[PDB]
Amino acid sequence: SIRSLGYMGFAVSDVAAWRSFLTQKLGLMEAGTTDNGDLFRIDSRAWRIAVQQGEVDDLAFAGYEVADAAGLAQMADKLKQAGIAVTTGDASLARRRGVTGLITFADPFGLPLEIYYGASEVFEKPFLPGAAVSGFLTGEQGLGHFVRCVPDSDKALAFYTDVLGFQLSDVIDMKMGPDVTVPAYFLHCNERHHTLAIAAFPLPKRIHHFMLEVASLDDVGFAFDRVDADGLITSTLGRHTNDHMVSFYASTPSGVEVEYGWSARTVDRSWVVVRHDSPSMWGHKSVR
Amino acid sequence: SIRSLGYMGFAVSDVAAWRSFLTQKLGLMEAGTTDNGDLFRIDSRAWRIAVQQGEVDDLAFAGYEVADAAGLAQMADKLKQAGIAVTTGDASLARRRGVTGLITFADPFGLPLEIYYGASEVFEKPFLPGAAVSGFLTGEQGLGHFVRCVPDSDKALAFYTDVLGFQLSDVIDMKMGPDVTVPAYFLHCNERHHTLAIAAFPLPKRIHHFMLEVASLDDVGFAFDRVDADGLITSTLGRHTNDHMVSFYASTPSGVEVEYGWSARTVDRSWVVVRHDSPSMWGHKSVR
Amino acid sequence: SIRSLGYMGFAVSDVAAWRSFLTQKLGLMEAGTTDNGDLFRIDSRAWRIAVQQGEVDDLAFAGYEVADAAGLAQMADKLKQAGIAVTTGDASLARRRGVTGLITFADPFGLPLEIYYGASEVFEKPFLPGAAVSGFLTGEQGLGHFVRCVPDSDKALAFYTDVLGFQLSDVIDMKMGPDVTVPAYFLHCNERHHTLAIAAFPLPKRIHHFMLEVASLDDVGFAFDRVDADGLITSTLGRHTNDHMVSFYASTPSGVEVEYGWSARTVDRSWVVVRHDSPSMWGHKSVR
Amino acid sequence: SIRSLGYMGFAVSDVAAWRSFLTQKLGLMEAGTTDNGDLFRIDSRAWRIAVQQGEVDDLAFAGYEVADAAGLAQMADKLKQAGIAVTTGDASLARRRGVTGLITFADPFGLPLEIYYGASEVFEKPFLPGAAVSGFLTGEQGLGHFVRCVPDSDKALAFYTDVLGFQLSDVIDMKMGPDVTVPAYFLHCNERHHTLAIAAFPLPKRIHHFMLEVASLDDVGFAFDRVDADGLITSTLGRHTNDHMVSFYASTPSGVEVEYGWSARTVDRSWVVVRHDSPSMWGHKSVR
Amino acid sequence: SIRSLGYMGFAVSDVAAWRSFLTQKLGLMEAGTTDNGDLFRIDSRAWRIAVQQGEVDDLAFAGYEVADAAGLAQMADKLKQAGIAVTTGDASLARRRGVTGLITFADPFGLPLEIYYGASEVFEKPFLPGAAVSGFLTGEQGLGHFVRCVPDSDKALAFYTDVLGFQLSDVIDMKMGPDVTVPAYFLHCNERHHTLAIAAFPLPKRIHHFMLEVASLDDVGFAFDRVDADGLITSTLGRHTNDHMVSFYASTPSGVEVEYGWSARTVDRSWVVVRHDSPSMWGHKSVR
Amino acid sequence: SIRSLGYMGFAVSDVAAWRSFLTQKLGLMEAGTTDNGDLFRIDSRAWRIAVQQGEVDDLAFAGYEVADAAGLAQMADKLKQAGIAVTTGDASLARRRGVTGLITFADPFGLPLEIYYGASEVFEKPFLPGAAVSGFLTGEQGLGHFVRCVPDSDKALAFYTDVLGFQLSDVIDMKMGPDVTVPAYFLHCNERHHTLAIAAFPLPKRIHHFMLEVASLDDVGFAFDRVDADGLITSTLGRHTNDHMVSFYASTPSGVEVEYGWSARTVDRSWVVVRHDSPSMWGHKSVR
């Protein structure tokens, strides 16, 4: 059973721009370079985000974490039984990722996915942010979330819920012009309101954005100014209707956006699926 | 599995009187008019109470909420297996109710019931009461409760417990004159002491009253004076023996009564069924 | 410096009616009979209320407590310097009151007052109420309060503030008919919002009422029903605008009223004098 | 599944002595007389202890509480399957006990037992103790506990654990003289450390003692003095090794003893069975 | 200004008996022998109790602690102005006591007293009790208290309050036979209810007893059994009416008694002087 | 199901050196000598560590605790089904261990193991440490942990996880020289991060060390100095990367080391297996 989103890798055209963006603007910690690419940290894990040179300028792969080897075995079986082509990552890949075991495959629309267990911790190299950030919220909630753009939401849903086991949190009917309303589906696999959202948006990228959650309002406020100085803000500060996260959006060097937020509410046993007609209570004025 | 009472609809002869009563006396928020009728809010949901023009001057339908589509499917099966005629609400009805999916049917004595999932939230339109009320208590406890008057309590019980899944909280043997004692059964489907009560009272209505719970004693005290000014109080302030709610009762424009209370105790895993001979510890002096 | 109202004595025509009223209706503990009269307890003190046979059917004396002998000395001096006739109570009176030392005198309009120190505690005879009452609130706030009716409020004020040291909490302009508005002054000598109130009401008694504060809302609710059964309620349940006490009023056998309340707010260092035009937020409907 | 010990009935030769003992010494509330005998209360339940005239001067019956009718049904089946003669109490017995439904039977050595559901609550008649007691601890822990004397502990154990479902807490090897060591078994059916203890002691009675738990140390201290005044103390104040209860023991008018205690520790999921060689850490000096 | 009772010294005929009594029965820590005598600890201070060989078998001296050198200077002046013969302790005495500075004198009836500042701490030699005791309560409340027997209470009072600065807490009128009532005065110099009590009892000793306060009820219970084993208990467990301390009394090898207690209430700014007719709520049965 | 490590026994060449080491350096309580050897306590249990005369100078046996007789039965079956030779300990062995029932067997590499239930508590003999220690942390976490040295980690793992039921917490790849990296596996059976660790180290002993956890940082600091005085420290103070325990290591008289720590983090339901490349965040400098 998937416990959380553990890591993500980006294939970008300008690695230097990304390095500077992630550390100086967002405050991530530079963790060195390896055959896994330029590594970045936000907590005790050896790395959470990897940046590799590439032409797509998009998310290259995402890794989902299971608790142990038994969990890995369950998932591999679930995928096989579903007719998905799964590959047991070899020792070489596992060493490159810094994990104990992993299986690889792709989602229905070609996004490379990895499910692994036993990632590396580096408590002996205490996290020191590249900019003034009090802390990032990970723990049992994992890395954060990302919005997967797909040509067919229903096909994507069946795969993520029935095969991968994500559960629906809620749906937002996004009005994109008078003759267009696109439902966005928010899915959770732990307490975090959503670790994955699915929507059929007309974008050239695999994801609309990825999100990182910080510990205080000031972390968000200071980061906003740092990003704003370079004219990279895409949405003003606002609060979402569904997860109640206070956040802003900005452009990364690849065009893909990043959401930087604070104070999201979690999902619990009493949770019930609901629908919304707006993605924000207040703010989030688009300045794109 | 039913999680809570989600909404109620009334068919009344004087819609204007109801509108004024609900907002100015009870403090509900007027949420507009649609083909679903005049809508009223008490929390983040798009509506909780609907008022439609009608001759019965009574509860027209009640909607029970399940967590998701799987829950809806379970309930539909449970009802079918019980031999109840169930109808999958069409897109038209679902849109009118502002829900994602719903099934319709009736209780053994003709009360139209609906079980649905995926209701609409409107966090972007913050709740503002029509009168000074600090807040209403809903959340996982749902809307509140109502007392269903029936000609046969045993038949009603078998349906609500065996088919709908409500659990018994307790029983109160209500003394209505020397040669008459009527047992009232209190049922729960979540933490709220009771979401439904059943009693064979000789009333022309489907329900004796519906109840709304507020956040503070002052909310109740101020509302009492507002209602008292128009001579609509039916029972003075008092506290119930079973749910320990402090409340008063008043007449709505349809003759059906409304209970307005505060500070009820909840049901938990350690709960055991008990019986009482009185419905009130103190107060609740009838002034009908 | 006066720390609190410590005890009160009533001279009544029907001692038996009072005994029954105080214990069975209000829940005080019967503490025996002495040359000080029938004694009643509400806490650890040997007695707080004394009932003696008398024709006035009114408050006979009130005792204010100082911390020690030095405090008693200060007060005696303050009174002498003000030209008030003060008498050092003899050993006989002190023994009758169960106190260590006391001085006697009268207010400007003839109410016998006593200031004392070193009252008797009886922790070895645990308080057991005459009716179901969870507890009375005394402690550093003393016995409670009473409203002193006077022919001249200004003269009364100068005496109670300048000579006795009480401080003003607030004022309520009580509308008694179109051509009559009477200001009621509320005074404190400790945290209790008011230990004494002064008003020029046209009543035959020295006080309008005395007040006792209980620990829970149920104490008030149950007591209301007990009193209501005998038709003695004078005001329905309500909450005051100034002290925020939730209470009801009832008639004692002497015509003097008693207020029984719960949840009053206290006075602190940040307190500022204010004025009100109403004595109640809600309730307190007169049924006299 | 048995949730707790709900009530007990005693058949005694001197009902008046018992009435006075329970109210004046222990502080129970006298709840009237019925065909169920003299009734006594310690909480919201209509009665917990019944005293009937009888020659045995011992426990006459004990009632164990289940949560509902389904629970009653389960227990009846469990007993039947075990070959125990069970009788469904008739409406007459149920009305006498003030319960909704009950089954009767006897333990292996003739103690009449009853399992019931739906007892009567009397919140409208607030508990008022017969002596100064802050409160008794019942709730989900039930009435308290009693020690059942049996000729064969192993046979008794098999019945109480395998048939009735009690679980072992711990065992104390009680040294009764050089050539005699008797194991006492402590059993729980809820959080209370033990609701029942079994030991093969050479006593003429069915039980060694019953225990009532109070809310504060002073409740115990004051009760000790009240009992001591009549020379009824059998063990000085002490604390048990297993439940950590601070208590004293005294003789009731029937010779059966009563334990009056405070501050016992509870049993939880992490609990493991252990053994002790002493029943007390300190105190509990026998003065029999 | 005196902050607390800091240390005490006893001159006894059997030093070995005292050593064994203090460590094995009461749980004090043996801190070595010096020219100050056998030293005992109860906290971080180098010593709190000193035992020297002597014929009086009584308290030999008591030391009161001031905050600093200025405080010492104030006290010396206060005493001189009162006409008391004060001696500035020489370096030899100060070194023997392990203090920075001290003055010596005697109370009106010959008890040698010392006021000092700058006592020695020994945090590097962690306190380890001689018996199982969770801890002693000292801190800002100092060592504990003792009852000074005097031939004239009034003369003693004037000295302790007017000259030494102690404040009265309360008075207990101790009934010693029909024709004898002796008032006992309880004085405080900090939060501890009383650090000194004065009474004109007919005893051969300078003090009736000294008291040590422990951290838990078990400390008291276990100590009671240890002392009881040697037949040294003088009063059973009980709770005082004035300080609400739960304690027992026992005989030391010198005849002087020791009180060992727990859970006393403190004195605060709202405190008022009161009187009692009994020294105990419950217990404290004399077995002398 | 194994609940915790309950006790351990050592067979040593110098019993006197061990006695002195455990009490004076580590602060354990000497609990007497029996046919079970010299017994030592750290909490309410009659003994936790036994020292017997022997030539191996190593761990002689370890006892794992189950909750009851049913648990013992389950384990015996699990072992039999695995083909392990299990022996039901006779009454003689059970009495020697002070337990109710036990089974004996050996791990794959000859370490004698015992699984038991119903150990002896001695609350009547309060724990008093041999040195100043505020307390040891046991409870539901049991005794502590030990590192089992084995020639084949994989064979050891299969036995401890598949047969005994321990669960993996994490793995640390211990670098022992350039051409050697040894994985150490940490296993838990309750909240304690690990009760057992397995590693293929080249040591002559069955275990590398055993660990005892204390209640405060000062307990560790003071113990460090006591041990350091005799030159027995093997690792300076440091904090582990996996359990976050702050500790030091020292040599026992048998060469086997002991870890003395404080403040370890626990394992919960959200726990996921991870890997580390270092066993310490800071400190733990080897001075061997």
Ligand SMILES: Oc1cccc(-c2ccccc2)c1O
């Ligand atoms: O965290 C979130 C919560 C709700 C909606 C969005 C969202 C915004 C823009 C496009 C797609 C989704 C989101 O990111």
Ligand SMILES: Oc1cccc(-c2ccccc2)c1O
């Ligand atoms: O909330 C409640 C709790 C207990 C009884 C009633 C009740 C009152 C009148 C008629 C029927 C039931 C109630 O409303």
Ligand SMILES: Oc1cccc(-c2ccccc2)c1O
């Ligand atoms: O506690 C109180 C607070 C405010 C007003 C009154 C009051 C009521 C009637 C007559 C005079 C005063 C009062 O009693």
Ligand SMILES: Oc1cccc(-c2ccccc2)c1O
């Ligand atoms: O609560 C208790 C805890 C432990 C032992 C006893 C006990 C005492 C005497 C005889 C039998 C049992 C007990 O009552």
Ligand SMILES: Oc1cccc(-c2ccccc2)c1O
């Ligand atoms: O702590 C205490 C509180 C109250 C009274 C005493 C006392 C007892 C016996 C003789 C003198 C005083 C006492 O010690």
Ligand SMILES: Oc1cccc(-c2ccccc2)c1O
């Ligand atoms: O508690 C612990 C946590 C992590 C590693 C060790 C360890 C140290 C040395 C050798 C083997 C293991 C340990 O003891």
Ligand SMILES: [Fe+2]
């Ligand atoms: Fe987002």
Ligand SMILES: [Fe+2]
């Ligand atoms: Fe109701």
Ligand SMILES: [Fe+2]
């Ligand atoms: Fe008042």
Ligand SMILES: [Fe+2]
């Ligand atoms: Fe007992």
Ligand SMILES: [Fe+2]
């Ligand atoms: Fe004392």
Ligand SMILES: [Fe+2]
């Ligand atoms: Fe370790």
